[PDB]
Amino acid sequence: SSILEERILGADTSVDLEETGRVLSIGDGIARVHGLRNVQAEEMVEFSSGLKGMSLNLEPDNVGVVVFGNDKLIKEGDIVKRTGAIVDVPVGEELLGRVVDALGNAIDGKGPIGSKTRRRVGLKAPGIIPRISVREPMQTGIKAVDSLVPIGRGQRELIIGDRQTGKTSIAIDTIINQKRFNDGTDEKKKLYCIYVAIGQKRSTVAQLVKRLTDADAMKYTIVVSATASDAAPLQYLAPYSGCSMGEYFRDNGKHALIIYDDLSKQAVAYRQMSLLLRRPPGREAYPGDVFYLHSRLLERAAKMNDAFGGGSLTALPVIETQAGDVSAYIPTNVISITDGQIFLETELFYKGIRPAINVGLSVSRVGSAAQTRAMKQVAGTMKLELAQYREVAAFAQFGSDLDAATQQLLSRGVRLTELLKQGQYAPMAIEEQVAVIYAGVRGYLDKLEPSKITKFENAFLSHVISQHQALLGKIRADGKISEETDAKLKEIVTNFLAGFEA
Amino acid sequence: VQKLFVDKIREYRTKRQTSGGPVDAGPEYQQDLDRELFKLKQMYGKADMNTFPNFTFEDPKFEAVEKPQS
Amino acid sequence: DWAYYKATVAKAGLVDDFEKKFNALKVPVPEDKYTALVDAEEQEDVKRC
Ligand SMILES: Nc1ncnc2c1ncn2[C@@H]1O[C@H](COP(=O)(O)OP(=O)(O)OP(=O)(O)O)[C@@H](O)[C@H]1O
Ligand SMILES: [Mg+2]
């Protein structure tokens, strides 16, 4: 076969003097190395068998080293070499559509990635001059997110909640929903995505590449993967490597997005890795600088000014909490780095509100209110009509009857609550959202039954995409819902309501 | 190590003298390539080499509606 | 997409010939059985008009 022989003539057998430190111990991943005089801190050192490692502690006698791999091929008396480089990963657009490990080697088997430029995992966030405020929107296609808790481009938003409530699905409808902009024509409405899998078994990450490839979502993302089987210094290095492929886009013009799933598993890989280096424990045996661990990460998510390129880098960190308690140590340290949050609960998921977003508590510094112009009209009034609902709609035990007074307002909420529910891996558009939200707030649904609105939605939505395609194209193009555009929609809802149930 | 460069090409050319697949398979490669050839067909399906699609479909029968009117 | 990957496949005989034989015939269309109630049901309401 011609492929094996051409791989062996391209191999370079270069030999040079190394700089070399004999091993004194090896246990549980830590290799105290005698020698290694001129070593830097955070330098990448290379064992004899092919392993790789990073020298963290410097000390007068020994040199502490942690291993990127497995510590059973390493025996006392081995040889540790010097590369001569603080730890760096490859970068580029050439990694797009791949699954890679935490140092940039492909675990999909499509071959060697041809990459040209290398970028550190420990670089610095930009300061005060080269930013700008948040001008643009980032559409998720969820209807409880886009209307009530909008997210700008360049804003760190925290998805927080328990296990098995919707934290991964929320951030995968977002990956799917940008399919419509990426095959379009303008280069400033796209959104290239990145998913970082920390502490997850391979029978979830090889299954999420399936869900992202029938919908052809994988042609514009990267998956940096550090599974639960990996060395504890490989789950620590993963978000600092994934964030550094995001800043190929942001430092060259385009717009990126990055999900850390999750960041409660980049902390217990720092607690273990830095207890076996004999560093004294803090609270819950976490180190002193877990706040400095997350903060030097979540400040690269910038929004540059237009004299640098104007690119953005959103971030969506996921956080799993125990028993729904938000006052823990690692939650509160990362609530106060992000601009806004999305509080996912369990009693919302089980009563029926799915996606289970607490729209009361899901606060957001609105991002210079870049919702969009037409959604401001219909979800401006929706925000207040739902807020009016929640103050007054928690009895479950009625004794008196005020249908002219109270029962009209709470009938507007259940029509807007059951409108907000959604499916899974089928995200809408924004003008298909303006139409369905128009029909809810304008009183055109109070003569239905609430057990029929989820049935009313898909029959409505199929009618407008089929028969009214030139209608929705004037909302997406002109931005606003104009007064003559208010006129045309006034018949369509009432013509359909005249013949919906028959 | 160009003396090792010649010595892994020259024992690659010896592998290019092949008669029937494996050189030292015995009961190893014969069982494994037959175990794997079933698994690409076991949970996949029973399919021949060139047989076309052979079936037939029947549509919904159009019933009538009886209606005395006026 | 039958002609696409069979060309890059080398094992012909039953590959390029099966796509040559099975793709050279007519589409089996449906039967037009709905004609009786088209005329006989219509005019009896117009005659009642
Ligand atoms: N929009 C939705 N509507 C109804 N059910 C959903 C929706 N999205 C997800 N689910 C269901 O909720 C369950 C949990 O979702 P998901 O796996 O994203 O939770 P998770 O908290 O990320 O899980 P883990 O705790 O393992 O990370 C899944 O069974 C999924 O099918
Ligand atoms: Mg999850």
Nearest CA owner, ligand 1 atom 15: A166
Degrees to nearest 5, angle at CA A336 with A332 and A342: 80
Instruction: Evaluate whether A454 touches A421 at the Cβ level (below 8 Å).
Output: yes
Please tell me whether residue A475 adopts helix, strand or coil conformation.
helix
**For ligand 1, atom 16: residue with the closest CA:** A166
**Letter string b/e over residues A295-313, b meaning 16 or more CB atoms within 10 A of that residue's CB:** eebbebbbbbeeebebbbb
Residues of B in contact with A6 (CB under 8 A): none
Tokens of A468: 């009214």
The residues that bridge with A196 in the sheet, in sequence order, are A224, A260
* Amino acid letter, A97: G
Q: Rounded to an integer, what distance in angstroms lies between the CA atom of residue A275 and that of residue A64?
A: 12
Cα(B31)–Cα(A4) distance, rounded to whole angstroms?
26
CATH architecture of A16-85: Beta Barrel (2.40)
Which uninterrupted H or E stretch holds A91? strand A88-91
A372-502: CATH topology is Lysin (1.20.150)
Q: Which residue CA neighbors atom 7 of ligand 1 most closely?
A: A424
Q: Considering the domain A86-371 in this protein, what is its CATH number?
A: 3.40.50.300
Q: Give the residue from chain A lying closest to B12, CA to CA.
A: A5
Contacts of A14 (CB under 8 A, 6+ apart): none
> Which residue matches tokens 């009896």?
C44
Contacts of A122 (CB under 8 A, 6+ apart): A42, A86, A87, A240
Any C CB within 8 A of B39 CB = no
Which tokens hold the place of A410?
């709470």
In whole angstroms, what is the distance from residue A471 CA to residue A247 CA?
A: 39
A163 Cα: distance to centroid of ligand 1 (angstroms): 9
Classified as helix, coil or strand, A312 is strand
User: Within a 10 A sphere around the Cβ of A339, how many other Cβ atoms?
Assistant: 18
Bond before A262 cis per omega within 30 degrees:
yes
CA–CA gap between residue A358 and residue A170 (Å, rounded): 14
Chain B residues in contact with chain A using a Cβ-Cβ cutoff of 8 Å: 1-2, 4-5, 8-9, 12
- From the CA of B55, how many Å to the nearest CA of chain C? 10
Contact A13 B1 (CB under 8 A): yes
Annotated active-site residue A82? The verdict is no
Residue A326's Cβ-count burial label (10 Å; 0-12, 13-18, 19+) is middle
Q: Any residues with Cβ below 6 Å from ligand 1, and which? A: A 163-169, 354-355, 422, 424
Tell which atom from ligand 1 comes closest to the C-alpha of A167. Answer: 22
Whole-Å CA distances, A118 to A42, A89, A91, A255: 16, 6, 6, 20
Which residues, in sequence order, are bridge partners of residue A316? A259
Interchain CB distance below 8 Å, C28 and B56: yes
* CATH topology match: A16-85 vs A372-502: no
Burial class (CB in 10 A: 0-12, 13-18, 19+), B61: exposed
Encoding tokens for residue A431? 């003008």
Q: Are A26 and A67 in contact (CB under 8 A)?
A: no
Instruction: Locate the ligand 1 atom nearest the alpha carbon of residue A161 and give its number.
Output: 21
Query: Which residues is A223 bridged to in the sheet?
Result: A99, A195
Q: Which residues of B touch C34 (CB under 8 A)?
A: 62
Q: What is the resolution of this structure in A?
A: 3.3
- Describe the crossing of helices B2-13 and A2-9 by its angle, rounded to 10 degrees: 170
**Angle CA(A447)–CA(A390)–CA(A480) in degrees, nearest 5?**
65
A4 contact residues in B (CB cutoff 8 A): 12
Q: Which long-range contacts (CB under 8 A, 24 or more apart) does B52-58 make?
A: B52/C18, B52/C21, B52/C22, B53/C22, B56/C28, B57/C30
Q: Are A379 and A148 in contact (CB under 8 A)?
A: yes
Eight-state DSSP code of residue A452 = G
- Three-state DSSP at A61 gives coil
Q: What are the domain boundaries of chain A?
A: 16-85, 86-371, 372-502
Cβ of residue C41 closer than 8 Å to a chain B Cβ: yes
Q: Does C15 touch chain B (CB under 8 A)?
A: yes
Residue A328 burial (C-beta neighbours within 10 Å; 0-12, 13-18, 19+):
middle
Residue A221 token pair: 């993302």
For residue A481, the SS3 value is: coil
Q: How many angstroms separate the CA of residue A3 from the nearest CA in chain B?
A: 12
**SS3 state at A95:** coil
Query: For residues C27 and C17, what is the distance between their CA atoms, to the nearest angstrom?
Result: 19
Bridge partner residues of A67 (DSSP): A53
Query: Cα-flanking dihedrals φ and ψ of residue A208, to 5°?
Result: -80, -25
Compute how many other C-beta atoms are within 10 angstroms of the C-beta atom of residue A403.
Answer: 8
Which residue from C21, C22, C45 is facing B69, i.e. has the nearest CB? C45
Q: Whose alpha carbon is nearest atom 30 of ligand 1?
A: A166
Sign of CA dihedral A64, A68, A70, A76: negative
Angle (nearest 5°) at CA A493 between A492 and A495: 60
Instruction: Please answer whether residues A45 and A54 qualify as being in contact, where contact means their C-beta atoms are separated by less than 8 angstroms.
Output: yes
Q: Which residue's CA lies nearest to atom 17 of ligand 1?
A: A164
Of C14, C33, C45, the CB nearest to B50: C14
Q: Which of A305, A244, A294, A302 is nearest to A269 (CA)?
A: A294
Is A408 annotated among the ligand-binding residues?
Answer: no
Contact with chain B for residue A2, Cβ under 8 A: no
How far is A365 from A20, CA to CA, in rounded Å?
53
**C and A adjacent (3 or more CB pairs under 8 angstroms):** no
Residues A177 and A210: their CA atoms lie apart, in Å, by 16
Task: Give the separation between CA A312 and CA A315, rounded to whole angstroms.
Answer: 10
Q: Residues with Cβ < 8 Å from A24, sequence gap 6 or more?
A: A32, A33, A34, A62, A76
Centroid of ligand 1 to alpha carbon of A282 (angstroms):
34
Indicate which atom in ligand 1 lies nearest the CA of residue A424: 1
Q: Which of A140, A143, A164 to mutate to test the pocket of ligand 1 (most atoms within 8 A of CB)?
A: A164
Which residues does residue A79 pair with via DSSP β-bridges, in sequence order? A22
Query: Which of A4, A11, A13 lies closest to B12 in CB terms?
Result: A4
Q: Which residues, other chains included, contact C25 with Cβ-Cβ below 8 Å and sequence gap of 6+?
A: none
The response to whether A88 counts as a known ligand-binding position is no
According to DSSP, residue A267 is labeled S
- Tell me the pairing of strands A21-22 and A79-86: antiparallel
Among residues A269, A267, A196, which one has the least CA distance to residue A229?
A269
DSSP A113-162: ----EEEESS-----STTB----SB-----HHHHTTS--BTT-BEEEEE-
- Tell me: is residue A154 an annotated ligand-binding position: no
Residue pair A365/A373 in contact (Cβ under 8 Å)? The answer is: no
Q: Cα separation of A29 and A336, whole Å?
A: 33
Q: How was this structure determined?
A: cryo-EM
Measured distance CA(A326)–CA(A15) in Å, rounded:
56
* Cβ-Cβ contacts under 8 Å, C41 against chain B: 64-65, 67
Nearest to A103 by CA among A73, A72, A67: A67
Catalytic residue among A365, A373, A412, A415: A365
CA distance B45 to chain A (A): 21
**CA contacts within 13 A on the Cβ side of A499:** 5
Number of C-beta neighbours around residue A175 at 10 A: 25
What one-character DSSP code corresponds to residue C33?
-
The span from the CA of A179 to the CA of A321, in Å, is 31
Cβ-count burial of A80 within 10 angstroms (0-12 exposed, 13-18 middle, 19+ buried)? buried
Does the annotation place A371 within a ligand binding site? no
Tokens linked to A387: 């807020």
Locate C12 and state its tokens: 């012909």
How many whole angstroms separate alpha carbon A202 and alpha carbon A225?
Answer: 9
Which of C14, C31, C37 faces B64 most closely, judged by CB atoms? C37
Q: List the single best residue of A6, A12, A13 to mutate versus B (max B Cβ within 10 A).
A: A13
